[PDB]
Paper text:
The structure and accompanying biochemical data demonstrate that SpoIVFB positions Pro-σK at the enzyme active site through a β-sheet augmentation mechanism, and reveal key interactions between Pro-σK and the interdomain linker connecting SpoIVFB transmembrane and CBS domains.
To further investigate the overall architecture of detergent-solubilized SpoIVFB and Pro-σK preparations, we pursued cryo-EM reconstructions of both WT and E44Q SpoIVFB co-purified with Pro-σK. Aside from the difference in oligomeric state, which we believe arises simply from variations between protein preparations and fragile monomer interfaces, the final structures of WT and E44Q SpoIVFB:Pro-σK monomers are virtually superimposable (RMSD ~ 0.5 Å). While the orientation of zinc-coordinating residues H43, H47, and D137 of SpoIVFB are conserved with those of mjS2P, the cryo-EM map of WT SpoIVFB:Pro-σK does not show any appreciable density for an ion being coordinated by these residues. This lack of density was consistent in the cryo-EM maps of both WT and E44Q SpoIVFB:Pro-σK, demonstrating that SpoIVFB:Pro-σK complexes fail to co-purify with the Zn2+ ion that is essential for supporting Pro-σK cleavage. In both our WT and E44Q SpoIVFB:Pro-σK preparations the purified protein is devoid of the catalytic zinc ion. In this work we identified dimeric, trimeric, and tetrameric oligomeric states of the SpoIVFB: Pro-σK complex. We believe that these oligomeric states are likely an artifact of detergent solubilization and weak lipid/detergent interactions between monomers in the purified protein preparations.
Author numbering:
A (entry chain C), C (entry chain A): 1 to 288
B (entry chain D), D (entry chain B): 11 to 126
Write the structure that this text describes.
């Protein structure tokens, strides 16, 4: 009743979008601007509705000249279900839009060609919003699928590599085969810029993940996953294998001999609080 | 037949990594909550000020040092500084955190140099 | 040369260019806009890159609505060699663009229409930015040729006179043949405005040249050219006939008979430092 | 022929006559080199600080004299002001230069009145 009020009064629009909309209204293209604006707005509110329901921390709902964004501040902060319930809510409003359209136009309220154009643009947007490329929407689903069976670093590297190869394939197809189609060049440029920006910060995500892992107190304890490493492995290397939403007991191996199991919280507290880092498991075995 | 009539467009979520700075009023409430005993307040306080780690670490680059150790010591210094910060004197927390992290990285660099 | 990168990231754009792009995006003229923008950007980048080599005070490279502009800071205070080198940075640049277009057409990346369009636009801009007008590279070549055997002031006067005559000829031709094609009219207005500006700034340009000459550092000392003058004029009227990049041993004629030989240094120092700017030249033989 | 379908574009270098005023750091280093002693620093400073002559001459119209002599007096007064500049007076360099230019123009006006 009050939470959504700021979301309503927080819409920002790029000035270039204003210029494009005014010129399109001027030069005939009126039946097309409304359809695209309505589709984009509906999709953005679909993204935001689940985010605000989970009591997330949104910033702004922008409207780029080539799409829309809903900036949030949760990366590696919430479990798989919380992110999935927001990501899937994007490519799930077009279904009810199509259901409304196929009944509104069939009862012959407006016209046929308008329905044809609406369906064309709607389906085109839906199938463009699922390319397995970061960030889009399919790429994040692929990242979630990887993260559930792989260590976080491994998932964040394989997803990055797959997005890179798909981006190069798309760029080759756009530049060398298809005619000009400026809407494809801008897509390629945006994808490359976003991917490079994500690569440039491949390090803070891990530390944010570990920091959030430190301060979980009875956060709905879940499956216990035995983990075993050798004795001379460094502390950072053994901490690198921490998959999301799993508590990992550590078993040390002193070249065939195991001393005792160590709790994950113990090792992580030794990392942060006691500052007993840059050492192997032997140092943590015998304290001060 | 179909190409040259598609409007591609995008609709993504843009997961950021640098939270916005905290206001000048909620800081006192967060500090009081931490004083009475809380941990989510500590998380929110040490996550909102992460850009300082980047700011100082960028200055110390081009010295033949990996980013992993630099960021680790930076976060350790920030948590140490916030863990022992006193508001009785009166000073912007950003300067205190910056001095703490700079001192921590300088101490680590001096220790590493002495090791060699 | 990281100043190249600084300039390329410091490229301003006029607000009207966004409106032009918006009008060209809803109508279908992206190919022409891209070709023209590419040609103009290559021209400007070549000019700026070759200007940085000689360490000039380049301000910024910006794209005004009807072309481009490099804001070179040094006007008439340099040897003509580097000026003539930098001005030819663009007429000697379209050659490799044409070669690249030929190669791309032969490999069949682009079909057999865009190649002709690009060649037509390239060979039109090359022949437009060469007319004997000031500005445009025609003036910055004809004037440099003029300043090789003539005094600087006379060269500038004759250059502006010829530029005005040719601008009037072009305006008459446009009015007689094409009463349309707004591009010609805006080009004419630009030419007239710039001609007025460099007509109004002539005094300061000349004073800058003279002051730079006085504070010389023996920049590639060339042969010495004498100057025989009668002792009945004003000193500002004898310093006017100064060539470019030449030291002049001043020869004075007293009632038709040679009296003494004086270097430019002492007379110019007496004119500036000694404040004898409006007295005479005859008493400079025996200042004390 | 092809004249009907043509586009005219311009790509030229515009040579400014009055360079923009320079900030404190570079003028400070130029004055430091001035103290060391160099004519090129004098040339650069007078070149960068020539706009004041234009302002003074523009506001000193309605006099009935020529322009070349006024510009020459302005620039010679500017040179006299820069060579006599001191950082201990306690005022901006631009104001001192403007005062010197006005003084020189007034001196020329008095001389012309005496001659006439
Ligand atoms: C967040 C909101 C953003 C909204 C943006 C503006 C919204 C308007 C979109 C504008 C736009 C797409 C451009 C998208 C680029 C934007 C990408 C942004 C990137 C930023 C960097 C949609 O325009 C559509 O509007 C429809 C409404 O009428 C019409 O199609 C409907 O379909 C029927 C069913 O099959 C329906 O029955 C019927 O009703 C309609 O016929 C057409 O007008 C068109 O399909 C216009 O595209 C343009 O493409 C080019 C060549 O294709 C065209 O150029 C020329 O065409 C010939 C005629 O001059 C010329 O001979 C030729 O020389 C030249 O080729 C243009 O003419 C125009 O077509
Ligand atoms: C930073 C760079 C900024 C550059 C600006 C834009 C650059 C883009 C050029 C834009 C522009 C030149 C005008 C330049 C004026 C700009 C002056 C700037 C002053 C700023 C203040 C394109 O000119 C060329 O574009 C090419 C694009 O394809 C086309 O050539 C072809 O390309 C290939 C395909 O066949 C082939 O291979 C190739 O063989 C072809 O030749 C043709 O359109 C044309 O040759 C505008 O077109 C102009 O011509 C016609 C339309 O045809 C319009 O006539 C109108 O017709 C009715 C229909 O409305 C109207 O009822 C009527 O009223 C009006 O008569 C004009 O009015 C105007 O629209
Ligand atoms: C910095 C720019 C590169 C150097 C400049 C050299 C001049 C380029 C000459 C090529 C023809 C003119 C192209 C003008 C635009 C155009 O008209 O593109 C029109 C053509 C359309 O092809 P089609 O419809 O005929 O295909 C028919 C299919 N059946 O798309 C292209 O070919 C674009 C590909 C070549 C452009 C250079 C690619 C550079 C790759 C590296 C990127 C580096 C930065 C590039 C910044 C854009």
């Amino acid at each position: 009743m009050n939470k959504w009020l700021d979301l309503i009064l927080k819409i920002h629009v790029h000035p270039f979008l204003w210029i494009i909309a005014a010129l399109g209204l001027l030069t005939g293209h009126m039946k097309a601007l409304l359809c695209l604006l309505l589709i984009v707005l509906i999709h953005q509110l679909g993204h935001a509705a689940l985010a605000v329901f989970f009591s997330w921390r949104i910033k702004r709902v922008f409207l780029l000249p080539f799409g829309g964004t809903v900036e949030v501040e949760e990366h590696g902060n919430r479990p798989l279900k919380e992110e999935f319930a927001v990501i899937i809510a994007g490519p799930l409003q077009h279904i009810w839009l199509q259901f409304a359209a196929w009944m509104l136009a069939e009862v012959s309220v407006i016209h046929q060609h308008t329905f044809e154009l609406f369906t064309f643009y709607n389906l085109s947007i839906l199938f463009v919003n699922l390319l397995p490329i970061w960030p889009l929407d399919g790429g994040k689903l692929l990242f979630l699928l990887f993260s559930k069976q792989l260590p976080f670093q491994k998932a964040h590297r394989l997803n990055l590599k797959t997005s890179l190869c798909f981006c190069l394939l798309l760029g080759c197809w756009v530049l060398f085969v298809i005619p000009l189609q400026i809407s494809a060049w801008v897509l390629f440029v945006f994808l490359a810029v976003s991917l490079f920006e994500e690569y440039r910060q491949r390090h803070y995500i891990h530390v944010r993940f570990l920091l959030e892992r430190y301060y979980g107190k009875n956060r709905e304890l879940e499956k216990l996953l035995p983990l075993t490493v050798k004795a001379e492995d460094k502390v950072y290397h053994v901490m690198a294998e921490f998959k999301r939403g799993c508590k990992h007991p550590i078993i040390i191996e002193k070249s065939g001999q195991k001393l005792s199991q160590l709790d994950e919280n113990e090792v992580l507290h030794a990392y942060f609080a006691d500052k007993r880092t840059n050492s192997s498991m032997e140092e943590l075995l015998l304290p001060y | 037949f179909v190409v040259k009539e598609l409007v591609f467009l995008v609709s993504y979520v843009k997961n950021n990594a640098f939270p916005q700075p905290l206001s000048s009023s909620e800081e006192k409430k967060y500090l009081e909550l931490m004083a009475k005993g809380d941990e989510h307040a500590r998380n929110m306080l040490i996550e909102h000020n992460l850009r300082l780690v980047a700011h100082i670490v960028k200055k110390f680059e081009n010295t033949g040092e990996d980013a992993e150790d630099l960021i680790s010591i930076g976060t350790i210094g920030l948590i140490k500084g916030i863990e022992s910060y006193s508001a009785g004197k009166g000073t912007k927390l950003a300067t205190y955190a910056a001095r703490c992290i700079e001192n921590e990285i300088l101490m680590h660099l001096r220790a590493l140099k002495k090791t060699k």
